[PDB]
Amino acid sequence: ADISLHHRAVLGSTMAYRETGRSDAPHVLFLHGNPTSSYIWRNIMPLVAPVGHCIAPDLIGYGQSGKPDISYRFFDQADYLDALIDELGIASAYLVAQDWGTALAFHLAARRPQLVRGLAFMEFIRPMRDWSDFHQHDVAQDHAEAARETFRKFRTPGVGEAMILDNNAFVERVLPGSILRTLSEEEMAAYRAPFATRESRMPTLMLPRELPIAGEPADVTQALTAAHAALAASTYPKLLFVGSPGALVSPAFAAEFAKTLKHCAVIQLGAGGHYLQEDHPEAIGRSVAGWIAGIEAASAQ
Amino acid sequence: DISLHHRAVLGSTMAYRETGRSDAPHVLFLHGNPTSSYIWRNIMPLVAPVGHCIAPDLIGYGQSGKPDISYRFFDQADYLDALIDELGIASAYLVAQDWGTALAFHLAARRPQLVRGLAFMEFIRPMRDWSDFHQHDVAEQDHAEAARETFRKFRTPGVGEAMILDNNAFVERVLPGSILRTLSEEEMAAYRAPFATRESRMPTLMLPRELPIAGEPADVTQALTAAHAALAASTYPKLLFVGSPGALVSPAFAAEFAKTLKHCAVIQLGAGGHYLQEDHPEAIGRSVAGWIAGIEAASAQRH
Ligand SMILES: [Cl-]
Ligand SMILES: [Cl-]
Ligand SMILES: [Cl-]
Ligand SMILES: [Cl-]
Numbered sequence A: 001a002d003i004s005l006h007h008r009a010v011l012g013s014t015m016a017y018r019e020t021g022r023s024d025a026p027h028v029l030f031l032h033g034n035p036t037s038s039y040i041w042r043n044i045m046p047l048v049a050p051v052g053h054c055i056a057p058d059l060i061g062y063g064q065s066g067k068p069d070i071s072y073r074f075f076d077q078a079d080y081l082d083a084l085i086d087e088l089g090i091a092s093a094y095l096v097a098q099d100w101g102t103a104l105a106f107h108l109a110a111r112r113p114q115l116v117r118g119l120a121f122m123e124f125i126r127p128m129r130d131w132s133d134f135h136q137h138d139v140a141q142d143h144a145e146a147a148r149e150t151f152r153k154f155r156t157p158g159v160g161e162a163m164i165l166d167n168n169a170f171v172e173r174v175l176p177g178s179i180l181r182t183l184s185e186e187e188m189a190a191y192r193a194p195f196a197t198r199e200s201r202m203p204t205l206m207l208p209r210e211l212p213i214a215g216e217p218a219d220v221t222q223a224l225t226a227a228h229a230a231l232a233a234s235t236y237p238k239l240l241f242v243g244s245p246g247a248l249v250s251p252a253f254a255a256e257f258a259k260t261l262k263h264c265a266v267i268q269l270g271a272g273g274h275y276l277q278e279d280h281p282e283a284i285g286r287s288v289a290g291w292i293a294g295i296e297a298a299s300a301q
Numbered sequence B: 001d002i003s004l005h006h007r008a009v010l011g012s013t014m015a016y017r018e019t020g021r022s023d024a025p026h027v028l029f030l031h032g033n034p035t036s037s038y039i040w041r042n043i044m045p046l047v048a049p050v051g052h053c054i055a056p057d058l059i060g061y062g063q064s065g066k067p068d069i070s071y072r073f074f075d076q077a078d079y080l081d082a083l084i085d086e087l088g089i090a091s092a093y094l095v096a097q098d099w100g101t102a103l104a105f106h107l108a109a110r111r112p113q114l115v116r117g118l119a120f121m122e123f124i125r126p127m128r129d130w131s132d133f134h135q136h137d138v139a140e141q142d143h144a145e146a147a148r149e150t151f152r153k154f155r156t157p158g159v160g161e162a163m164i165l166d167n168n169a170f171v172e173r174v175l176p177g178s179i180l181r182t183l184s185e186e187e188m189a190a191y192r193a194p195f196a197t198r199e200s201r202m203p204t205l206m207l208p209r210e211l212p213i214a215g216e217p218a219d220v221t222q223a224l225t226a227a228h229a230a231l232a233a234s235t236y237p238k239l240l241f242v243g244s245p246g247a248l249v250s251p252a253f254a255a256e257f258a259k260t261l262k263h264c265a266v267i268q269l270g271a272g273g274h275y276l277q278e279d280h281p282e283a284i285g286r287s288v289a290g291w292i293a294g295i296e297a298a299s300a301q302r303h
Helices: A074-088 A100-111 A142-154 A159-166 A169-177 A185-195 A199-206 A218-233 A251-259 A281-299 B073-086 B099-110 B141-155 B159-166 B169-177 B185-195 B199-210 B218-233 B251-258 B281-302
Strands: A004-010 A013-020 A027-031 A053-057 A093-099 A116-124 A238-245 A264-272 B003-009 B012-019 B026-030 B052-056 B092-098 B115-123 B238-245 B264-272
Touching: A004 A074, A013 A074, A027 A100, A053 A074, A074 A100, A074 A218, A093 A100, A093 A281, A100 A116, A100 A218, A116 A281, A142 A159, A142 A169, A159 A169, A159 A199, A169 A185, A169 A199, A185 A199, A238 A251, A238 A281, A238 B281, A251 A264, A264 A281, A264 B281, A281 B238, A281 B264, A281 B281, B003 B073, B012 B073, B026 B099, B073 B099, B073 B218, B092 B099, B092 B281, B099 B115, B099 B218, B115 B281, B141 B159, B141 B169, B141 B199, B159 B169, B159 B199, B169 B185, B169 B199, B185 B199, B238 B251, B238 B281, B251 B264, B264 B281
Parallel strands: A027 A053, A027 A093, A093 A116, A116 A238, A238 A264, B026 B052, B026 B092, B092 B115, B115 B238, B238 B264
Antiparallel strands: A004 A013, A013 A053, B003 B012, B012 B052
16 A cells, blocks of 8 residues: 555656655655666565655656657656656655666766765666676676677667567566566566557667667766766765676675775675565665665764 | 674673674674573674674673672673673664663663664663553454563562573563564574573563563662663664564554654564564664664764
């Protein structure tokens, strides 16, 4: 019962979001990536409810949000998310993010440096100099190579169309292949539901093509480069969750990354895939809610 | 890795468990009756990345010594004070349950500079009469009146001795009766081990007789009254964990109590008994570690 669904009309379309917690608590934005929706935060938001006003948007073209006729590039995603945030009047918020949600969060904090009260993040996107940086790890390689090959295909003209628009591979193969626990039939149903038609899957094809790999595309590479430099300069508290062996972010890399930042703690979750929320909702929700309470306590008087 | 250590304190020795890097903030874990630092074993490893975790065994509990003392609330307070001084702990987070909260509140009242934060659950407060002890509105009222009855029998001369000294009722009946999951043979054995002999059981008898109920005993009542007044005025960060239906603290009481304090978040654990660590160790360890990370980052940013 506790989580409600809402919609706001913005940029000539609608954005959906899930909402829980007291109206008067600090704002907490939960930002999903590809090809998920605010549904992926369903077991995490109730744990954070006692300390934050939890808002979990569905990105444009994802979940219950509209499907306008737009390019669905990273910058489109940023623009729709901004519009919703502004419509709701959110001027100050914690961010909790994963996948393309972290790219959105980093870019948001860069453009709006007074907004972020703290960032909780995991499995984050950064500029990758070469394909060896996509899913980089030291554990005795076969998985990492096969994810590289999937995304190489997603990024190939015609091939990517057939895999994603025709066969919905990002939702049907990549998503469950990246979570350890067995998803229920209703959980798969909820993930595939926005994506029933071929055309509706375009956003899920657009995002692996926006990944900043070998400088391509340059616009996203450059924006995420600016965003990472702002992240490194920022002073707000940060919580970085990491799984083993890590998809985009290994435990070793998390540790080294965290030293490049101010006030970042690393939380080792143990075994996981790319989408950590489905294997660790309780460890994530519990950590985040205590972290917010801490920051709010220490910040006030 | 959690290691076990000893120090000579006052007229005896004290054990404590330790884990985490020696240059992180001190985090003290305080157990109650009739447990030991063993109860924190699945919680300390989750806080270890953010804190220097020390978990004492109270005098007469766990692996601590067994001096011929009265084992009153103040003897506990004195032996814990001395271990804290011996360890040179001047600043700490406190993580506490049952008589460990009494000790915590009493500690913080006397040394207000010490406390970086207090994470607490299922805590002792002066209770005006028995209906206060285990108050809830859930229709196992049977389980509540039973608990009251148990504790009234513990406080009765001759009867408490036969229940606890002769039969070891607190270890054998109250402890597992107050945890939702079934303890393994190994787990019971670790709760039994300090209380194998009849004379060892004395600490577990004295504490229910220390419980401040209808002003008795007057002295613990007065100390814990003072301690609750200082907790209500304190400004350090607080987490209060709460279980359903509640043993000493119901979710409804935790909500009213949080309104009395500054900077206290109430964390809902769901179904649990009086001893919350055995059913919710991941939720507690994760919450505490998160809270510490947040307080340390915001305090660093500030100063
Ligand atoms: Cl996601
Ligand atoms: Cl992607
Ligand atoms: Cl305890
Ligand atoms: Cl007791």
